[PDB]
């Protein structure tokens, strides 16, 4: 329906932190013909920025928006590094040993447009900058430590580097309900539940029940999340619940999951309405 | 060589840290046939430990003994994280699109032993995996983030990827001195220069001189290092003995060896540990 004021507010980061990113310009001196121009390519070709809004929700919800707008530049530096990373994971998924695509939303992938090598040291530099975009952000050291912490946990080999394995491991292997659970929550929800506990330790507030209900809500959605993701490839071979459950069963779990996701959320009203209000939104317009 | 108290200590510090690494161990349970076995494989079969003990030598000099021991595990994860970073690009150079490699030392490299895929998100997770190291270290908020900072900016795009690109791209072409130099200088020196650097951060105090007098060593012994690693190489491409000759490259690397022994001599009256400590190390390297 219609946008409050602080669903307004929000909005409107969302559309500035895109253009951030679109002006971002790492200045690269040397006698190679392409690595410069190459570097953040894919990050500029891709984006619906699901991570970004996910961290900008929470974040925008819980500081003030004129406290906010004194750090507003070190909050995008933030969000663009959790976009990096998730970049940096599509550019080595789509390479010939794994995916081997040309394409990624009709634009060349790295490997098609120059070669192998590049990509996965572009994907490579892409990994190492979002750290290095971490802690060159201007918070309190105590905040960039922890963001660098989470990060690297959930982005790393215990968290989505082991999803991808997985996937590309078992890509023509049908694999049971626990198994198939197990492989999404790490490919997927965990950089997802990440941006959201990401948005409260950037916020500079210290609730320690909020953090856990964050982290197990973005898990809970990062499973829903890909259980529509699964959903959409069929209407438009994988590890996906489709091939587990049939189309109308996951249809059904989608919906169920959906509810859950949404009901979970309708508790967080009392002590965090701004919050509630902003996460709310970005649901609807995913769950649509 | 009859060992000072401090040449001594740091003789022993470079010892622990070879058990505290042997013995390091990450819990990694998943339906993956390998993964966990393959995560930090090469890191324990790998070489010569150069970079920490270039970051050991800082420290040890630098900070008073007993006060090393209270933090020593915090020292110690920080010097893996170098190492592991390190250990990523190499089992990333080994790969079929790069050097094509089937053992590294004496051990079989990560794509002959298991797949390609695997050996790329190994490399994907060792990179990630140094930042979380990091990220975890016990040390004031302050240093850590410093160190990422210089991780991040000496390992990555700017660094030491550069001239890994530059070296892959430039592989089917003869490059002149002065470019082979900037390749060297990024693919290998960069990250040498940084070791150095962050057992200066490391070590808590505060000395700007001293910060860009290592920078600039690391970056010269880093140069001396790969010029004597391009002949060895020639004794059991764009090399130097390929450009120069192995006549002028053996000239070359004995008067940069002296360059560097007699830069690092002025060190003796204002840091007499820190000499001694690198003197030593240096020593050593340029035997054999």
């Given at each position: 329906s219609l946008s409050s004021p602080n669903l307004s507010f929000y909005y409107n980061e969302c559309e500035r932190f895109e253009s951030f990113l679109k002006n971002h310009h790492l200045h690269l001196e040397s006698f190679h013909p392409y690595l410069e121009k190459a570097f953040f390519e894919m990050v500029?070709?891709?984006g619906?920025?699901?991570?970004?809004?996910?961290?900008?929700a929470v974040l925008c919800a819980l500081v003030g928006q004129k406290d906010y707008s004194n750090q507003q530049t070190e909050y995008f530096k933030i969000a663009l590094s959790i976009e990096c990373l998730h970049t940096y994971s599509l550019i080595h998924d789509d390479l010939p040993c794994m995916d081997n695509a040309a394409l990624r939303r009709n634009h060349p992938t790295l490997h098609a447009k120059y070669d192998e090598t590049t990509a996965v040291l572009i994907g490579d530099a892409?990994?190492?900058?979002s750290f290095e975009?971490?802690?060159?952000?201007?918070?309190?050291?105590?905040?960039?430590?922890?963001?660098?912490?989470?990060?690297?946990?959930?982005?790393?080999?215990?968290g989505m580097i082991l999803?991808?394995?997985?996937?590309?491991?078992?890509?023509?292997?049908?694999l049971n309900?626990?198994?198939?659970?197990?492989?999404?929550?790490?490919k997927t929800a965990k950089l997802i539940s990440a941006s959201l506990i990401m948005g409260l330790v950037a916020s500079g507030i210290k609730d320690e029940e909020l953090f856990k209900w964050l982290q197990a809500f973005g898990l809970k959605m990062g499973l829903c999340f890909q259980v529509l993701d699964d959903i959409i490839d069929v209407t438009q071979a994988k590890n996906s619940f489709v091939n587990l459950l049939?189309?109308?069963?996951?249809?059904?779990?989608?919906?169920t999951l959906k509810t859950?996701?949404?009901?979970?959320?309708?508790?967080?009203?009392?002590?965090?309405?701004?919050?509630?209000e902003n996460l709310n939104a970005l649901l609807n317009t995913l769950f649509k």
């Open positions: 500029l070709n891709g619906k920025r699901f991570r970004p809004k996910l961290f900008l892409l990994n190492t900058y975009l971490l802690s060159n952000a201007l918070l309190e050291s105590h905040i960039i430590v922890e963001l660098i912490k989470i990060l690297s946990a959930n982005g790393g080999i215990k999803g991808q394995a997985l996937d590309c491991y078992f890509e023509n292997t049908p309900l626990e198994q198939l659970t197990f492989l999404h929550e790490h049939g189309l109308e069963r996951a249809n059904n779990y989608a919906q859950e996701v949404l009901n979970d959320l309708d508790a967080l009203k009392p002590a965090y309405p701004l919050l509630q």
